[PDB]
């Protein structure tokens, strides 16, 4: 069952789009599905498989983090926190930066490329007096 | 330099001095080795410890801007380790510094100069040594006069 | 000299030249497939501008109270620090402009506080020294909203102590493929984007709850958008940027090849020299 | 002046000359090989039968299976050959050879000389057989002689 | 023996037919293994062509290698 | 002088058991100094064991002074 305007996105990545008429999905504070003609409104819903009724009767669960989902007028969309906001939780990330900024901490790029590239400029400087015998 | 000739003039050689194309060929109008000359009779003891202290350190910067000279020329200068760019503007500041005009040497070129008084310049060895003047303009330092000269060309320029 | 010292150089040279196409290519690859990748931002956040604002009508006459932010206190700076090598002038520039905004700020006098992501402005402030709260550091090519949760929430501790009125937000921006300008960015001020609001919003809205919730919850999610894009703008601008540094950096040293081919030339002509006074010394 | 090398099918250029002689003018100029690879020869004979144009110019070669005086020789026999046709009043130009062959030819001449080479040890008056050589293109007033050239090239040096 | 360092001018006029007409790509492709090879070096996550390519090189020479004191067909 | 650039086959016979004992380091030092050099050049590449090291070696370096006219005991 798709609807008419509706998708599943967040910058990061959209999760589904086009129309779905039909959908199957725990709002957080109730009942929810998708059926066309309803009015405009807001909502977030927890986190969960949503198993909705698309174009050409697709239907499927939709694992939720949960997020706050809404239609405009006419228009259905989805947002949803990747993952459900902590509470406390970045807290322990202040304390880590509160540390990490009062004991020193690092974190490292991977790129092989980079390390031979080092390698490569030490070395290639490396064993270079020839400047001297160069003239000018 | 293998020049046995000059093997002779080095081996007798009493006082000498040298110059520099590149240098020369810098522009520079005094145009000498620095680097190169030296002087047997410099005693420090003599000399006081201000003296050979400064003019040690001078040679270390040489020493240094010759030693990055490389690297640069390399890399240019994208790199350049804060505290070593800075001693890089205090060189190239401190070439461009040694010159000074000449009263009689209005001749070649028409400016002027002057005789120089020698405790001035252990001042110029400290603010120098200092950096003392942190604006200090380049273009100002070259063939140019004492600090308060140079001070009034700051003022200028 | 001898070519030990000629050719010793010259392998210098060939070596490096090798270094240098290995440094462009691969550079430029990685710099091509940033630019292809970082594309995908805008979808979230400019559904939240527009929703947001939509909203706003009527509707944002109610209350201001994340709007107010903080009041008149200290001010603050976003910034960003560099995983990546060589890559150019950069934090130069941007560390530079930050050094005036940092005069202003003294010149305005008014009380701030420093963050940092990244380790190079961290080597910048940290070198520089200031007063920082935290930095967050090498997320790397893969930077993670999770990752940037932490210090996010340490800074929602700002606007939340009210502590700090006005902060800024600071990445160059991509004068696309030819450059990328430096940009730094006002922050906690208010949006303020009114074309949004400018009708009054149609669509039926129910809100089951207040919205205010909304404000402090979504108004964070949304903000976390811009931050995550133009740290990536920063992050393929930074490949491509490296990328060019290559090619004229590289370029360079054959000139230096072709005075050493005159050095092997002086000295292929006196090899040919001594051995040739010497081949009359022989002939003696 | 010649530059090109193996792999270039000069002859095709050659060719290219002979349309170029003929249908051009009827002035007709011959060139002649010394010190070189036989195989090229013969085969540019046949190559000359397959150009079937051969007729209007043809040479001795050198093919450096010889001693030097003959090589060294070579040259003024060319020049009193064509010397002809430009004497006809006739005008050409010919290809020549590996001059550092030649010069070359001419040091090898000076230690037979027993005379002290030039330096680098050049033919000591090489310069001047060169004065024999380039001295003696010309075109006349009523004659016109040109020619091409390509020397061993040396290292590029 | 020199990786197309050494030269020849005479050439494949001798060749077989088949061995004339088979031999080609060696001398190109080969050289496009040396020289293609670099980027492995600093150069990593290439894309396939360089993968088939470089590995029918670089096994393909391990199949030129050949025993001291062997004959051959 | 370098290490290294001057050495002496006689070696170490005439070096006295405190002073036989105590001298090893230098060469690696030498070495170290010498060898810490070798990243000098790549900046801010090392952390604090190489900085020990290399502190350590800048030390020793300082540790090397003379007079020009001076009398040992």
Redesign the interface.
């Known amino acids: 069952a798709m609807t008419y305007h509706l998708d599943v996105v967040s910058a990061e990545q959209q999760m589904f789009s086009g129309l779905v008429e039909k959908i199957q999905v725990t709002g957080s504070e109730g009942e929810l599905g998708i059926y066309p003609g309803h009015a405009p409104l807001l909502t977030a819903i927890k986190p969960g498989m949503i198993r909705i009724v698309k174009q050409h009767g697709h239907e499927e669960f939709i694992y939720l983090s949960g997020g706050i989902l809404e239609v405009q007028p006419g228009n259905v969309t989805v947002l949803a926190d990747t993952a459900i906001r902590g509470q406390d939780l970045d807290e322990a990330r202040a304390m880590e930066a509160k540390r990490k900024a009062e004991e020193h901490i690092s974190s490292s790029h991977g790129d092989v490329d980079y390390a031979q590239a080092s390698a490569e400029l030490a070395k290639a400087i490396a064993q270079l007096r020839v400047i001297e015998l160069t003239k000018k | 330099l293998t020049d046995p000739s000059p093997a002779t003039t080095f081996a007798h050689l009493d006082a000498t001095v040298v110059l520099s194309r590149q240098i020369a060929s810098l522009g520079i109008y005094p145009a000498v080795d620095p680097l190169d000359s030296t002087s047997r009779q410099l005693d420090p003891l003599v000399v006081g410890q201000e003296h050979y202290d400064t003019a040690r350190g001078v040679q270390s910067i040489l020493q240094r801007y010759q030693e990055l000279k490389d690297i640069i020329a390399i890399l240019g200068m994208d790199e350049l380790s804060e505290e070593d760019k800075l001693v890089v503007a205090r060189a190239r500041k401190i070439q461009r510094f040694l010159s000074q005009p000449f009263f009689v040497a209005e001749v070649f070129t028409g400016s002027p100069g002057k005789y120089v008084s020698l405790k001035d310049t252990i001042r110029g060895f400290k603010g120098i040594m200092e950096g003392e003047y942190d604006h200090l303009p380049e273009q100002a330092f070259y063939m140019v006069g004492s600090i308060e000269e140079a001070v009034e060309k700051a003022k200028k320029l | 000299a001898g070519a030990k010292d000629i050719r010793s150089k010259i392998a210098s040279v060939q070596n490096t030249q090798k270094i240098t196409k290995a440094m462009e290519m691969v550079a430029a690859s990685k710099m091509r497939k940033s630019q292809d990748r970082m594309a995908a931002s805008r979808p979230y956040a400019e559904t939240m501008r527009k929703v947001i604002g939509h909203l706003a009508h009527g509707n944002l006459e109610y209350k201001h109270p994340y709007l107010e932010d903080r009041d008149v206190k200290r001010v603050g700076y976003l910034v960003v620090s560099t995983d990546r090598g060589l890559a150019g002038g950069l934090n130069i520039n941007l560390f530079k402009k930050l050094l005036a905004e940092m005069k202003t700020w003294t010149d305005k006098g008014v009380q701030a506080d420093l963050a940092m992501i990244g380790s190079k402005g961290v080597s910048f402030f940290n070198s520089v020294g200031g007063n920082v709260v935290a930095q967050v550091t090498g997320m790397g090519d893969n930077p993670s909203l999770s990752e940037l949760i932490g210090p996010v929430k340490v800074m929602l501790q700002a606007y939340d102590e009210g502590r700090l009125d006005k902060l800024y937000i600071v990445s160059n921006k991509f004068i696309n493929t030819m450059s990328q300008v430096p940009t730094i960015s006002q922050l906690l001020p208010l949006p303020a984007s009114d074309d949004d609001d400018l009708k009054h919003k149609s669509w039926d809205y129910l809100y089951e709850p207040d919205p205010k919730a909304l404000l402090d919850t979504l108004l964070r999610r949304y903000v976390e958008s811009q931050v995550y894009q133009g740290v990536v703008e920063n992050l393929a601008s930074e490949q491509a940027a490296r990328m060019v540094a290559m090619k004229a950096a590289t370029d360079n040293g054959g000139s230096l090849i072709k005075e050493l081919q005159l050095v092997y030339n002086k000295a292929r002509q006196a090899s040919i020299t001594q051995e040739l006074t010497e081949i009359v010394s022989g002939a003696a | 002046g010649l530059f090109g090398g193996?792999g270039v099918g000069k002859t095709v250029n050659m060719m290219e000359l002979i349309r170029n002689i003929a249908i051009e003018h009827s002035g007709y100029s011959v060139f002649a090989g010394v010190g070189e690879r036989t195989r090229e020869g013969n085969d540019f004979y046949h190559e000359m039968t397959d150009s079937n144009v051969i007729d209007k110019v043809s040479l001795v070669y050198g093919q450096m299976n010889e001693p030097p005086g003959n090589r060294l020789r070579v040259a003024l026999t060319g020049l009193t050959m064509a010397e002809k046709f430009r004497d006809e009043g006739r005008d050409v130009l010919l290809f020549v050879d590996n001059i550092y062959r030649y010069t070359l030819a001419g040091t090898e001449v000076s230690a037979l000389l027993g005379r002290?080479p030039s330096?680098?040890?050049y033919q000591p008056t090489l310069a001047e057989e060169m004065g024999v050589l380039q001295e003696r293109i010309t075109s006349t007033k009523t004659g016109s002689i040109t020619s091409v050239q390509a020397v061993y090239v040396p290292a590029d040096? | 023996v020199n990786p197309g360092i050494s030269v020849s001018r005479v050439g494949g006029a001798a060749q077989t037919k088949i061995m004339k007409k088979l031999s080609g790509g060696i001398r190109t492709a080969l050289a496009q293994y040396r020289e293609l090879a670099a980027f492995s070096q600093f150069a990593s996550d290439l894309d396939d062509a360089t993968r088939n390519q470089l590995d029918h090189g670089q096994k393909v020479t391990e199949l030129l290698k050949q025993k001291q004191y062997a004959p051959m067909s």
């Open positions: 193996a002290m330096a680098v040890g040096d």
